[PDB]
Structure 1
Amino acid sequence: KIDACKRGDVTVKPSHVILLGSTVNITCSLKPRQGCFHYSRRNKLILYKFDRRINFHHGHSLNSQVTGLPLGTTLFVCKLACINSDEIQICGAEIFVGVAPEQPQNLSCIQKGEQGTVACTWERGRDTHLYTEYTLQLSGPKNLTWQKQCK
């Protein structure tokens, strides 16, 4: 099992996907066996957003509450700085701030010629910063429907 994170694990509350406006509790925690080889009150456990320092705790447990996150993805990486050795990246979290999806206001289906494949077009609306899945369903007079997903 390749493990991306060994020295320590970082958790996010409630989740990596959050509604625009919500506040995430990024918490960097270090496993007891791993740590700075020489205890010293100089080593720190920094947390960086886009390589920008947001917090620093000498103790293994680091707690942060980032707020006003804009729409998009922010990489919070939690590195360990020892006394003389260079910083070792320990673990990180990628947060996607998103909003509720826009409903398609107008739907039009056009078939080209007497023999043609029906094609339906919609107005997506504002782009939510999240993966979007679109399902188009066509039902005839009685209920018999064709199911197609635009992943």
Structure 2
Amino acid sequence: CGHISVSAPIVHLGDPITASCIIKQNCSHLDPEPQILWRLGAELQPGGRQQRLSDGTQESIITLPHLNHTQAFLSCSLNWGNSLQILDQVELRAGYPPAIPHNLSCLMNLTTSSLICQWEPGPETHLPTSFTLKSFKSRGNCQTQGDSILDCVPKDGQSHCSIPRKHLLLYQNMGIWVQAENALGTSMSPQLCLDPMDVVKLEPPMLRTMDPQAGCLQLSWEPWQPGLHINQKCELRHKPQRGEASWALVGPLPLEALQYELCGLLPATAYTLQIRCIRWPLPGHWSDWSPSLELRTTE
């Protein structure tokens, strides 16, 4: 019947809050006189201090010392009988403002044809907090402010965002950071500056056996179409299948080969081989190793 009002409904960590109950005498059997009692849900709260208008409404104000509870309900209830009557209720939260998002990173996925950034948001704030991936076309060190900033918004919950091709400017540099805001504050990750093209994630060619001397092998590997268009460098590694032997890396390869022969092995008749790639004179990062291929040697 009366009406609660506060300073701040949401607040820091463990701070105080201060509220008013303006209990109107217009509806009340025993007129507001029965002291109005403050609760934090089923908990009487000390401090209550009952003011007046005199011949008006009979208000009270109170001060919560340190709200030490992420959520909590503030019950302004009076007394009609041997029964407390809630007359207004209000919700109070408290938590933290957000921290700087650690470990932002991006890929370009040649299949979705888009740029996938992601981060870690670390410590939970206890508050409804939205993240956002801002980005902008620049040139250079990105310092020289590019102007149009592009918000890309993640799907509730998820901690990565994704920018489709139509909004990228391949072979040029953009700025990207994550913004994090809840109602206690906003924070920003450090800004990234990159060319989507130097973060392209490749996928390795798949090694396979042949068809047509001794201590030797023949295999072959077919491309990864999506990457064909990107001069990349590969390496093969091999070690005999059983034994705890150490992997042997082999020189620089091409992305595809119709016939390769590997000699100098033991007619040990059993090796494991995997190859992987990476965009070459241009910048790029390695690729997972291909699944393994097993085959025996000549003898």
Match of 2:95 among 95, 98, 117: 98
Per the TM alignment, residue 40 of structure 1 is displaced from its structure 2 partner at its CA by: 9.3
Per the TM alignment, residue 48 of structure 1 is displaced from its structure 2 partner at its CA by: 1.3
Does the CA-based 8 Å contact 2:25-2:31 persist in structure 1? no
Q: What TM-score do the two structures reach when normalised by structure 1?
A: 0.77
Does the CA-based 8 Å contact 1:135-1:148 persist in structure 2? yes
Q: For the pair shown, which has the larger CA radius of gyration, 1 or 2?
A: 2
The residue correspondences of 1:24-103 to structure 2 (distance < 5 A) are: 24-35=17-28, 37-39=29-31, 43-55=34-46, 60-83=58-81, 86-103=83-100
SS at match of 2:127: coil
Pair 1:39–1:147, CA change in 2 (3 A): closer
Determine the structure 2 residue equivalent to 1:8. 2
Does the CA-based 8 Å contact 2:20-2:62 persist in structure 1? yes
Structure 2 residue 110 is the aligned partner of structure 1 residue 117 = no
Determine the structure 2 residue equivalent to 1:131. 128
Match of 2:13 among 7, 13, 20: 20
Cα deviation, 1:21-71, whole Å, max 9, x if unaligned, reads: 321112222023133x13597x33211112111146777322211122225
Q: In structure 1, what residue type is equivalent to 2:103? A: N
Identity level (%) = 20
Does the CA-based 8 Å contact 1:26-1:65 persist in structure 2? yes
Determine the structure 2 residue equivalent to 1:146. 150
Corresponding pairs, count: 141
Distance across 2 between alignment mates of 1:93 and 1:39: 23
CA-based RMSD: 2.6
Distance across 2 between alignment mates of 1:119 and 1:93: 41
Q: In structure 2, what residue type is equivalent to 1:133? A: S
Gaps of 5+ in 1: 1-6
Cα deviation, 1:82-130, whole Å, max 9, x if unaligned, reads: 235x332100121111222111121111233455332211110211122
Distance across 2 between alignment mates of 1:136 and 1:45: 48
